[PDB]
Structure formats: structure tokens, C-alpha cells
């Protein structure tokens, strides 16, 4: 057993094995029985995450492979074409829009969850880390590990969300249209 996760309600458990199987098993009051068993990847399932809106969930593996499975029909929905290396850590935002993948090429990416397009990409090659992305749970900042040897920096702004950033970019443009 490599990784585990709780669902957002707290009644199912997702278990990721070494052979690539993914088991989903109930926890009702005290019973612990197996509901389904699908074969997801050809390799150890590294990390499992959940959408904060409860729509889908994301799995990563030791091939360059990262799916987005929706939670109603339990079928794959979007596939990220990430043929570089093995995904090590994996996390989402709290609005549920940014997806941070960090592979074993020592490079971090940033995608969308609705589409599968790329937003940004930083390369951190001179370090000897296993670098850890982590997003804050209440505001849209993140703490990326590894600055020199094994460290932790965190990346801030003056606005908390993306929604209070668009709302400030709108009101600064509006002054110029109220200027002309």
C-alpha cells in the first residue's frame, strides 16, 4: 500500500497499491467492505487527491501518467500529456483550478482542471531535493519546498484569492475608462 485518501464526505477510502490497482472501500459505521476494484495504472499509484468541489479526483503514477476521474460514473475524464518523468507530488488549489505536478526531472508544472492546458513551468535542476508543493487551505498561496538544500519558501501576494485579484484588476482598469 503506497497511498491512501479519504473522500470529502468521509465514508469511502481510496487505496493505491503497487501493482496499479485502486480499491474503493466503504466505512459505514464499523463495517469495512470492498465496493469496487479497478485497474488504473501500469505502475505504483503514487498520490491520490480530491477536488474541493467534490466533482472529480486525481491519481498519479510512476509512468508519466496522471488521470482525472470523475466521482459520479467513476470513469476517466481528462488526461494530462506529461511524458517527461514520474510524478512525485501532486496537489490542487482550494478553488479547485490550479493543479501542481512535480516530477523526477526536478521541474514543476501548473495546469487547469477544467481544461488540461499549461499555465506556467519552473525548472529547479541544480538542487538535490524531493521538492514538495503544498497549497494553503483557506487562501491561494503556496509553500514550495527547496530553496538551497532542503528548505521551504512560501510565495505570497497582497490579495488572498484569485477572485479578489480579478476584482482589483477590474477596478483599476475601470478608472482609466472613467478617465477618457
Amino acid at each position: 500500500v503506497y497511498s491512501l485518501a479519504w473522500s470529502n464526505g468521509g465514508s469511502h477510502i481510496f487505496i493505491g497499491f503497487k501493482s496499479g490497482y485502486l480499491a474503493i472501500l466503504k466505512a459505514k459505521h464499523g463495517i469495512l467492505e470492498v465496493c469496487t476494484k479497478i485497474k488504473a495504472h501500469t505502475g505504483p499509484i503514487t498520490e491520490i487527491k480530491m477536488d474541493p468541489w467534490g466533482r472529480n479526483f486525481i491519481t498519479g503514477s510512476i509512468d508519466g501518467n496522471c488521470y482525472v476521474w470523475n466521482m459520479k460514473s467513476l470513469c476517466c475524464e481528462l488526461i494530462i500529456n506529461d511524458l517527461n518523468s514520474a510524478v512525485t507530488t501532486l496537489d490542487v488549489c482550494h478553488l479547485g483550478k490550479i493543479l501542481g505536478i512535480c516530477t523526477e526531472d526536478e521541474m514543476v508544472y501548473f495546469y487547469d482542471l477544467n481544461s488540461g492546458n499549461l499555465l506556467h513551468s519552473k525548472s529547479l535542476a541544480n538542487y538535490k531535493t524531493d521538492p514538495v508543493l503544498k497549497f494553503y487551505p483557506d487562501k491561494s498561496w503556496y509553500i514550495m519546498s527547496g530553496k538551497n538544500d532542503t528548505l521551504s519558501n512560501h510565495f505570497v501576494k497582497n490579495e488572498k484569492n484569485l477572485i479578489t485579484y480579478w476584482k482589483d484588476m477590474f477596478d483599476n482598469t475601470m478608472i482609466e475608462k472613467r478617465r477618457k
Binding site: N8, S11, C35, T36, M71, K72, L74
Partner: peptide
């Protein structure tokens, strides 16, 4: 499985 999958989708 799919009948209780209506209850698993919540945030």
C-alpha cells in the same frame, strides 16, 4: 455502488 455514488459527491 452507483446508487450510493449520488451521496459520495459533496464538497
Amino acid at each position: 455502488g452507483e446508487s450510493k455514488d449520488m451521496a459520495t459527491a459533496l464538497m
